[PDB]
Amino acid sequence: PQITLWKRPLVTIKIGGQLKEALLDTGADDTVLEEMNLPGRWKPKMIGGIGGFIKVRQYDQILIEICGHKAIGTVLVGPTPVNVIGRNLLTQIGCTLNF
Amino acid sequence: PQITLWKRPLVTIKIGGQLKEALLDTGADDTVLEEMNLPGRWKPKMIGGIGGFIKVRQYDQILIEICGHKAIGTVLVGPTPVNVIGRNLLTQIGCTLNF
Numbered sequence: 001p002q003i004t005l006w007k008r009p010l011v012t013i014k015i016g017g018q019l020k021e022a023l024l025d026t027g028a029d030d031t032v033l034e035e036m037n038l039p040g041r042w043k044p045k046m047i048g049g050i051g052g053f054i055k056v057r058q059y060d061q062i063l064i065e066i067c068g069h070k071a072i073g074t075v076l077v078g079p080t081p082v083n084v085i086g087r088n089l090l091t092q093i094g095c096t097l098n099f
Numbered sequence: 100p101q102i103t104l105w106k107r108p109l110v111t112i113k114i115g116g117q118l119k120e121a122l123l124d125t126g127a128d129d130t131v132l133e134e135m136n137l138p139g140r141w142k143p144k145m146i147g148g149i150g151g152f153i154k155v156r157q158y159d160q161i162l163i164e165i166c167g168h169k170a171i172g173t174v175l176v177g178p179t180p181v182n183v184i185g186r187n188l189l190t191q192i193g194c195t196l197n198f
């Protein structure tokens with residue numbers, strides 16, 4: 001699809017059997033979801049945003065379907081203000097910026 | 100043009116007669132730029148993301164040129180670790196997400 005930006009670019013995602021809403025975020029290197037239960041091993045990690053750093057759980061090689069397009073990659077879970085899909089997965093679904 | 104997301108979508112902008120580099124950021128509601136002492140009146144604002152909030156100065160009806168595309172709108176100035184072109188100006192240059 002082609003998505004304009006007059007509203008937040010929110011899409012439905014499927015992860016770990018659950019549907020969620022997430023923001024397509026070209027300014028995010030990484031994908032960060034709010035607190036949730038994900039099956040799999042995880043490592044503690046730190047990530048930095050506009051306001052400083054937070055502690056997250058890093059899940060690797062996680063299947064996630066974004067607006068009908070499948071990706072398998074790293075998902076960070078922690079106190080992010082909103083679910084964001086970052087470039088690590090945006091590249092997998094073939095997402096580009098166009099103007 | 101079309102910008103893939105393998106790397107940060109950094110572009111040159113022109114604002115207040117100065118050239119800067121900024122991210123095209125679909126996750127940013129509003130444009131936020133590094134400290135720069137623009138003339139005119141402004142309004143205090145707080146913007147939040149990963150890690151919390153920072154204090155910024157809101158200027159309205161500021162002209163920015165983004166890869167030759169002119170736009171005019173709100174620009175927030177403050178101690179941001181990165182310059183981001185947000186949706187308020189990305190719409191004006193006709194920028195879309197596509198996959």
Ligand SMILES: CCOP(=O)(COc1ccc(C[C@H](NC(=O)O[C@H]2CO[C@H]3OCC[C@H]32)[C@H](O)CN(CC(CC)CC)S(=O)(=O)c2ccc(N)cc2)cc1)OCC
Pocket residue numbers: 023025026027028029030031032047048049050051052053080081082084086124126127128129130131146147148149180181183185
């Ligand atoms: C102290 C740390 O220092 P740094 O490491 C941080 O640098 C940064 C690099 C890019 C960004 C941009 C930010 N990306 C982000 O948070 O991504 C994180 C996960 O992926 C990695 O990749 C980069 C960072 C992490 C979002 O696109 C936009 N945000 C909102 C978004 C939705 C609510 C928040 C999830 S917003 O908060 O910025 C914002 C809020 C209100 C506005 N009107 C305008 C902007 C911010 C900081 O830099 C050192 C020089």
